Nucleic acid binder design. Structure first.
Lengths: 43, 417, 417
RNA sequence: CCGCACCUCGGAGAGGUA
C-alpha cells in the first residue's frame, strides 16, 4: 500500500506466476499430454 | 536479440557468428537451424530471447505464432502457445503477441512463451478490455480516400480516371471485373502505390492467392507495404489458411481502431479453393460449385465495413470473367449482386494498348453523394452525360486528350463550364 | 427484470451494475454472460425472473422463445419451452409467450419456462379458443389504404403517383417489378414511412433478407417500426428460418385480428435460398430451378389475403428483372401469373434522374373498383386515356408538372374538369 | 454415380497345498 516491497511484489507476482507455471502448470500440461497421447503397445 | 532482427540478416553473418561462438559447422546447415543453434547457445549463457508473431489457434486447443516473412506458413521454428496462456489472457486467432520466448527444453520442439510484453502493437491492458468486431455499428463509407497524387506525373492519369469513374472511401466493398489480359497487375500496383503515397496512415495489405512466383516477388519488391502471397505450388488448404489468417489480422486491427485496406486479386481463386476443400455433400450447383462453398468467401467479402466507433475495413477484390470456365462465370454472377461497386474493364480497348482500358459507362458508385461534394457530383453527372453517347474507345481517347491538357481535374472541370 | 430490457441496455451500464453487485471481472466477459450472472445473482436474493419471446418449435418437439432484435438467431441463452407445456397450452410456432422463468439448474443450458402469463400480447383465454387462419373465409381487397400524406410535401409525390397508378388496400397481394439500380430502396422507405404515418394501426414489417449490413443498419435507423433482416453473411438456412418465423408471426397476428403489412424485398433471394437448401430431387427445370423450390415462396406470397372475420394480411413484394441471370427471369415469369398487381419501374426514366421513375403504362391494379369510388375510377380512366398516347418519359414529366401545381390530387381532379 | 441453361485347446521356470 506504501513504498514497500509491494511495488516489487507486483512484478514479483509475475515472476511467481512464471515459477508456478514452470513447476506446476507445465507439469499439468505434461500430464494432459500423457493422458491424451498414445501408449506404446504391442505391434 | 530480436526474432525479426535475426530473421533478416544474411547467411554469411550468421555463419560467422556461429563459428565465433564455437558451434557445429554452419556451412552445411540451413539458416533456420543456424538461428536456432545460435539462440540455444546464447540462452545457455544466461541471456534473454525475444520473439513475436501472429497467433493461429488450432482445433485441438493449442496454437502457434506464425511469422510474417513466410506468408504465415507452418515452420519448424514456430512459437508454441500453451492452452493455459490462452485461458489466462483470453487469446484468439489473430491476436499479435510479442514478448520474451523461452527456448525448447529437453523433450520439446517449439519455443514457449515466457511473458507477453505487447499485444497487437499496443499495451496488454488496452487489448484485454475491448469490444468485439461483431458488435461494432456498421455504416456506409464516410471518409474520402483521395487517390490523386498531385505531383503531375504521367502515372497519375490512371488514378484521376479512377477517381472520376468511381471514388473509393474507407470501408468500401467493391469488385474489379475484368477479362484476361486486361492489365490487372499494373492497375493493382498503381492503386497500391497511390494508397501508400497519399494515405500512409492506413494499413495496406496485398493478398495474392494462387498466383505465379514471379508476380509475387515483383509485388513484394515494388510496393511499400506488407504482401502475403500463396503461389499455386501450395494446396488449397494453404490458401484457406492464409485467407483466414489475413482476415483475422484485419478484424483484430479494425477492433484496435485501424484503417485496414485489403487488395485481394483472388476472390475467384479463393472460391475455387473453398469449393475444393469443402467435403462433398452430394449436391452440385450450376458450374460445379458446392452449395456451402460460397459461404466462406461471401463472409470474407462481407467482413469489410465502416465502423463509427473507430477504424474501417476496405476490401477491393478483382473477379475473373470470360475465362472459358462456367464456374468462374457463376461465381462472378453470384458475387456481383453482393457488393456496391463494379469497375469493369473492356478487352476491345485493351487490345489497342490504350491504357487504362476502363469501361466508364458500366462503372459507378452507389451513394456517391456521401463521398463527394455537390459540385463534384454535378460535374461527374455532366461528364457522364457527355461521355455516354460516345463509344468506349472514343470516350477513353477523349478523356485522355482532355486530361493531357491540365494537371488536375479541377482545371478541366472549370474549363468545361 | 425482463430479458429484452436487459438486452437493450448498453454494455457500459451492464458492466457497472455487475461491478456494483460484486461479481467477478465483467470487462472480459460477454454481454450474455453478464446477463446470465446478474440473473443468477438476482434470483439468489429471492426475486422472480420474467422473460418473453416468440416461440420457435424445433423438429424434436421442444422450442425456444427467441428475440426479435437478433432476427430470431439461435442462441444458447433463451427461454426453453418443454414439450409438456406445448401439449398443455397447444402452443405453435409464432405464439408470443410471456411469463415467469427461472435460471437453469446444474446440467442445463437454457432458462426453463414455468407459467405463461400472456399469449400473443393478449389474454390466454382468447388465444386458446380461436379460429385458425386456414378456416378464415378469404375475400378481395375491400378497405382502402390511402398512401397519400396530404401535407403537400415533396416526398408525397411518390405516394400520389402510386395511388394514381396502383391503389393498395388491406389484404392486397402486389409486386414491385424493377431492374437493378432503379430506386427500390428509397421507394420502399417512402412506402414504409407513409404506412407508419397514415396507418399507425397497421403492423408494418420490413424483411430484408440477403442484403448488405449497411442497408440493414440504415433501414433500422430510418423507419419507425420493426426491421427483421438477415444479411448475406448468414447461410440460406438462416434465411429460411427467418422467413418461417416472420410468416408464422404474421399468421398469428392475423388470427388475432391485426392488419399486418409485410414489405418483402428478397422474394427472389428467398427463392434462391430455398432452391439452395432443397435436397437434390433429380429433376431440374429451365434456369437451374428445382421442382419443389418455388412451392415455399409461392405459398408465402399467397398467404396474403383479406379476412372477413377480422384483420388482413397485405404483402407487397419487389421483383428483380434484367439482372443478367435467366433464373431470376424464370422466377419473375412464374410469379407474374400469381399476383394481381405489378408496379413496374422504367430504367430509361431513371437514367434521366427523374425520380420516381415509375412505369405508369404497365402499372395497374385488378378489381380497382373495390378500392376507389365511381368518380375516382372515372377520373383515373380519363387520366390513363389521356396519358397512354404519350411516351413514358413525357407522361412522367406531364404528371410531375401537373402534380407540382397543387398539394393534393383533389385540386388536380377539380381543375381537369 | 458422365457434362446446366427455352427461335418459326501350447512348451519351460518360480512359488504353494494335501
Amino acid at each position: 500500500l506504501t513504498d514497500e516491497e509491494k511495488q516489487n511484489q507486483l512484478e514479483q507476482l509475475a515472476e511467481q506466476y512464471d515459477e508456478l507455471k514452470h513447476e506446476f502448470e507445465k507439469k499439468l500440461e505434461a500430464k494432459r499430454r500423457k493422458i491424451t497421447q498414445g501408449d506404446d503397445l504391442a505391434p | 536479440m530480436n526474432l525479426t532482427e535475426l530473421k533478416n540478416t544474411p547467411v554469411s553473418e550468421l555463419i560467422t557468428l556461429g563459428e565465433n561462438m564455437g558451434l557445429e559447422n554452419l556451412a552445411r546447415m540451413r539458416k533456420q537451424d543456424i538461428i536456432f543453434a545460435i539462440l540455444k547457445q546464447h540462452a545457455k549463457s544466461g541471456e534473454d530471447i525475444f520473439g513475436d508473431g501472429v497467433l493461429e489457434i488450432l482445433q485441438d486447443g493449442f496454437g502457434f505464432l506464425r511469422s510474417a516473412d513466410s506468408s504465415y506458413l507452418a515452420g519448424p521454428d514456430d512459437i508454441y502457445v500453451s492452452p493455459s496462456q490462452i485461458r489466462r489472457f483470453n487469446l484468439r486467432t489473430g491476436d499479435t503477441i510479442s514478448g520474451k520466448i523461452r527456448p525448447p527444453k529437453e523433450g520439446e520442439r517449439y519455443f514457449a512463451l515466457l511473458k507477453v510484453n505487447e499485444v497487437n502493437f499496443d499495451k496488454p491492458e488496452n487489448a484485454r478490455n475491448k469490444i468485439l468486431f461483431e458488435n461494432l455499428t456498421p455504416l456506409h463509407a464516410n471518409s474520402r480516400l483521395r487517390m490523386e497524387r498531385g505531383n503531375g506525373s504521367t502515372e497519375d492519369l490512371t488514378a484521376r480516371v479512377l477517381d472520376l469513374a468511381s471514388p473509393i472511401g474507407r470501408g468500401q466493398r467493391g469488385l474489379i471485373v475484368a477479362p484476361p489480359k486486361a492489365g490487372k497487375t499494373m492497375l493493382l500496383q498503381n492503386i497500391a502505390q497511390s494508397i501508400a503515397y497519399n494515405h500512409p496512415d492506413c494499413v495496406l495489405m496485398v493478398l495474392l492467392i494462387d498466383e505465379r512466383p514471379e508476380e509475387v516477388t515483383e509485388m513484394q519488391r515494388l510496393v511499400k507495404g506488407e504482401v502475403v502471397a500463396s503461389t499455386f505450388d501450395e494446396p488449397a488448404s494453404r490458401h484457406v489458411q492464409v485467407a483466414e489468417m489475413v482476415i483475422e489480422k484485419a478484424k483484430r486491427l479494425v477492433e484496435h481502431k485501424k484503417d485496414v485496406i485489403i487488395l485481394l486479386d483472388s476472390i475467384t481463386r479463393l472460391a475455387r479453393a473453398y469449393n475444393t476443400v469443402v467435403p462433398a455433400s452430394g449436391k452440385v450447383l450450376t458450374g460445379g460449385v458446392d452449395a456451402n462453398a460460397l459461404h466462406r468467401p461471401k463472409r470474407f467479402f462481407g467482413a469489410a465495413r465502416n465502423v463509427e466507433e473507430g477504424g474501417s475495413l476496405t476490401i477491393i477484390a478483382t473477379a475473373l470473367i470470360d475465362t472459358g470456365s462456367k464456374m468462374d462465370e457463376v461465381i462472378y454472377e453470384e458475387f456481383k449482386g453482393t457488393g456496391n461497386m463494379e469497375l469493369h474493364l473492356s478487352r476491345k480497348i485493351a487490345e489497342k494498348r490504350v491504357f487504362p482500358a476502363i469501361d466508364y459507362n458500366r462503372s459507378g458508385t452507389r451513394k456517391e453523394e456521401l463521398l463527394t461534394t455537390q459540385e463534384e457530383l454535378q460535374k461527374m453527372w455532366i461528364l457522364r452525360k457527355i461521355i455516354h453517347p460516345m463509344g468506349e474507345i472514343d470516350a477513353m481517347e477523349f478523356l485522355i486528350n482532355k486530361l493531357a491538357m491540365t494537371k488536375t481535374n479541377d482545371d478541366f472541370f472549370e474549363m468545361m463550364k
